[PDB]
Design a protein around this motif. Structure first.
Motif, PDB file in Angstrom:
ATOM      1  N   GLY A 112       0.823  -1.198   0.000  1.00  0.00           N
ATOM      2  CA  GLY A 112       0.000   0.000   0.000  1.00  0.00           C
ATOM      3  C   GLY A 112       0.867   1.261   0.000  1.00  0.00           C
ATOM      4  O   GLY A 112       0.615   2.193  -0.763  1.00  0.00           O
ATOM      5  N   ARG A 113       1.870   1.250   0.865  1.00  0.00           N
ATOM      6  CA  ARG A 113       2.776   2.381   0.976  1.00  0.00           C
ATOM      7  C   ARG A 113       3.402   2.693  -0.385  1.00  0.00           C
ATOM      8  O   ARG A 113       3.642   3.855  -0.710  1.00  0.00           O
ATOM      9  CB  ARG A 113       3.888   2.100   1.988  1.00  0.00           C
ATOM     10  N   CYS A 114       3.650   1.636  -1.144  1.00  0.00           N
ATOM     11  CA  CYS A 114       4.244   1.783  -2.462  1.00  0.00           C
ATOM     12  C   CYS A 114       3.157   2.257  -3.429  1.00  0.00           C
ATOM     13  O   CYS A 114       3.429   3.037  -4.341  1.00  0.00           O
ATOM     14  CB  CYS A 114       4.901   0.485  -2.934  1.00  0.00           C
ATOM     15  N   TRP A 115       1.948   1.766  -3.196  1.00  0.00           N
ATOM     16  CA  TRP A 115       0.819   2.130  -4.035  1.00  0.00           C
ATOM     17  C   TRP A 115       0.520   3.614  -3.809  1.00  0.00           C
ATOM     18  O   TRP A 115       0.632   4.420  -4.732  1.00  0.00           O
ATOM     19  CB  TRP A 115      -0.385   1.228  -3.755  1.00  0.00           C
ATOM     20  N   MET A 116       0.147   3.929  -2.578  1.00  0.00           N
ATOM     21  CA  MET A 116      -0.168   5.301  -2.219  1.00  0.00           C
ATOM     22  C   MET A 116       0.994   6.237  -2.559  1.00  0.00           C
ATOM     23  O   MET A 116       0.797   7.439  -2.730  1.00  0.00           O
ATOM     24  CB  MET A 116      -0.467   5.381  -0.721  1.00  0.00           C
ATOM     25  N   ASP A 117       2.178   5.650  -2.647  1.00  0.00           N
ATOM     26  CA  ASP A 117       3.371   6.416  -2.963  1.00  0.00           C
ATOM     27  C   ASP A 117       3.467   6.601  -4.479  1.00  0.00           C
ATOM     28  O   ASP A 117       3.461   7.728  -4.973  1.00  0.00           O
ATOM     29  CB  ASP A 117       4.634   5.690  -2.495  1.00  0.00           C
ATOM     30  N   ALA A 118       3.552   5.478  -5.176  1.00  0.00           N
ATOM     31  CA  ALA A 118       3.649   5.501  -6.626  1.00  0.00           C
ATOM     32  C   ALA A 118       2.573   6.432  -7.189  1.00  0.00           C
ATOM     33  O   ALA A 118       2.864   7.292  -8.019  1.00  0.00           O
ATOM     34  CB  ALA A 118       3.529   4.075  -7.168  1.00  0.00           C
ATOM     35  N   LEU A 119       1.353   6.228  -6.715  1.00  0.00           N
ATOM     36  CA  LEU A 119       0.232   7.040  -7.160  1.00  0.00           C
ATOM     37  C   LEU A 119       0.643   8.513  -7.163  1.00  0.00           C
ATOM     38  O   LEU A 119       0.619   9.166  -8.204  1.00  0.00           O
ATOM     39  CB  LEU A 119      -1.009   6.748  -6.316  1.00  0.00           C
ATOM     40  N   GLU A 120       1.010   8.993  -5.983  1.00  0.00           N
ATOM     41  CA  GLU A 120       1.426  10.377  -5.836  1.00  0.00           C
ATOM     42  C   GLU A 120       2.430  10.750  -6.928  1.00  0.00           C
ATOM     43  O   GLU A 120       2.382  11.852  -7.472  1.00  0.00           O
ATOM     44  CB  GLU A 120       2.010  10.629  -4.445  1.00  0.00           C
ATOM     45  N   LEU A 121       3.317   9.809  -7.218  1.00  0.00           N
ATOM     46  CA  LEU A 121       4.331  10.024  -8.236  1.00  0.00           C
ATOM     47  C   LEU A 121       3.671  10.021  -9.616  1.00  0.00           C
ATOM     48  O   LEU A 121       3.841  10.959 -10.392  1.00  0.00           O
ATOM     49  CB  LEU A 121       5.461   9.002  -8.092  1.00  0.00           C
ATOM     50  N   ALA A 122       2.931   8.953  -9.880  1.00  0.00           N
ATOM     51  CA  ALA A 122       2.245   8.816 -11.153  1.00  0.00           C
ATOM     52  C   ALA A 122       1.668  10.171 -11.567  1.00  0.00           C
ATOM     53  O   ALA A 122       2.072  10.737 -12.582  1.00  0.00           O
ATOM     54  CB  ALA A 122       1.168   7.735 -11.038  1.00  0.00           C
ATOM     55  N   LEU A 123       0.735  10.652 -10.759  1.00  0.00           N
ATOM     56  CA  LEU A 123       0.099  11.931 -11.029  1.00  0.00           C
ATOM     57  C   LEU A 123       1.175  13.005 -11.199  1.00  0.00           C
ATOM     58  O   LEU A 123       1.028  13.913 -12.014  1.00  0.00           O
ATOM     59  CB  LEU A 123      -0.930  12.257  -9.944  1.00  0.00           C
ATOM     60  N   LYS A 124       2.234  12.866 -10.413  1.00  0.00           N
ATOM     61  CA  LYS A 124       3.335  13.813 -10.466  1.00  0.00           C
ATOM     62  C   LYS A 124       4.315  13.387 -11.561  1.00  0.00           C
ATOM     63  O   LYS A 124       5.431  13.902 -11.634  1.00  0.00           O
ATOM     64  CB  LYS A 124       3.979  13.963  -9.087  1.00  0.00           C
ATOM     65  N   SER A 125       3.865  12.453 -12.385  1.00  0.00           N
ATOM     66  CA  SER A 125       4.689  11.953 -13.471  1.00  0.00           C
ATOM     67  C   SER A 125       4.113  12.404 -14.816  1.00  0.00           C
ATOM     68  O   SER A 125       4.835  12.486 -15.808  1.00  0.00           O
ATOM     69  CB  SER A 125       4.796  10.427 -13.425  1.00  0.00           C
ATOM     70  N   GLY A 126       2.817  12.684 -14.804  1.00  0.00           N
ATOM     71  CA  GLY A 126       2.136  13.124 -16.010  1.00  0.00           C
ATOM     72  C   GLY A 126       2.106  12.013 -17.060  1.00  0.00           C
ATOM     73  O   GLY A 126       2.861  11.045 -16.967  1.00  0.00           O
ATOM     74  N   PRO A 127       1.203  12.191 -18.060  1.00  0.00           N
ATOM     75  CA  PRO A 127       1.064  11.214 -19.127  1.00  0.00           C
ATOM     76  C   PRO A 127       2.228  11.312 -20.115  1.00  0.00           C
ATOM     77  O   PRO A 127       2.111  11.956 -21.155  1.00  0.00           O
ATOM     78  CB  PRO A 127      -0.283  11.517 -19.764  1.00  0.00           C
ATOM     79  N   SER A 128       3.325  10.662 -19.753  1.00  0.00           N
ATOM     80  CA  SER A 128       4.510  10.667 -20.595  1.00  0.00           C
ATOM     81  C   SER A 128       4.804  12.090 -21.075  1.00  0.00           C
ATOM     82  O   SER A 128       4.519  12.432 -22.221  1.00  0.00           O
ATOM     83  CB  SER A 128       4.341   9.727 -21.790  1.00  0.00           C
ATOM     84  N   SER A 129       5.370  12.879 -20.174  1.00  0.00           N
ATOM     85  CA  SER A 129       5.707  14.256 -20.492  1.00  0.00           C
ATOM     86  C   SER A 129       7.188  14.363 -20.856  1.00  0.00           C
ATOM     87  O   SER A 129       7.979  13.485 -20.514  1.00  0.00           O
ATOM     88  CB  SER A 129       5.379  15.187 -19.322  1.00  0.00           C
ATOM     89  N   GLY A 130       7.519  15.446 -21.544  1.00  0.00           N
ATOM     90  CA  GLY A 130       8.893  15.678 -21.958  1.00  0.00           C
ATOM     91  C   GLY A 130       8.980  16.853 -22.935  1.00  0.00           C
ATOM     92  O   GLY A 130       9.045  16.653 -24.147  1.00  0.00           O
TER      93      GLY A 130
END
Length: 130
Positions: A112-130
């Motif tokens: 969960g910690r990785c999930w709730m963590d990754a999630l935060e990142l995901a959103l903070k990762s954007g849909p393949s940005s660059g």
């Protein structure tokens, strides 16, 4: 940014609030700035998709209950995709779900910690940005 190999972030069997009677172990797929949920991995009737345009995690491990969290939108929005993976309104018709928030459950605090963590990142990762 999560440069692992594939676009997808992570996939695991997460438990969803048991509104029926018992938590439902659906197949949630963590994507880059998005999350998918499927009844199962075998067939894969698909359940729905969650958008992480800019969602955050607060967590909700409760007193004593493994580990859980809640992902809501600060800008009050729809944390649901207009369609799905194959551009489909909906896949199957199962238990009801939220709209703004989304309660999820993991196996171990770590997961969960990785999930709730990754999630935060995901959103903070954007849909393949660059």
């Amino acid at each position: 940014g999560s440069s692992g190999s594939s676009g997808i972030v992570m996939a695991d069997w997460l438990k969803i609030r048991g509104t029926l009677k018992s938590w439902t172990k659906l197949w949630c797929v963590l994507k880059p700035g998005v999350l998918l949920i499927y009844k199962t991995q075998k067939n894969g009737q698909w359940v729905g998709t969650v958008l992480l345009n800019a969602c955050e995690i607060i967590e909700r491990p409760s007193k004593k209950d493994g580990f859980c969290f809640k992902l809501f939108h600060p800008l009050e929005q729809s944390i649901w995709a207009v369609k799905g993976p194959k551009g489909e309104a909906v896949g199957s018709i199962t238990q009801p779900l939220p709209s703004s928030y989304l309660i999820i459950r993991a196996t171990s605090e770590s997961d969960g910690r990785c999930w709730m963590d990754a999630l935060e990142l995901a959103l903070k990762s954007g849909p393949s940005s660059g």
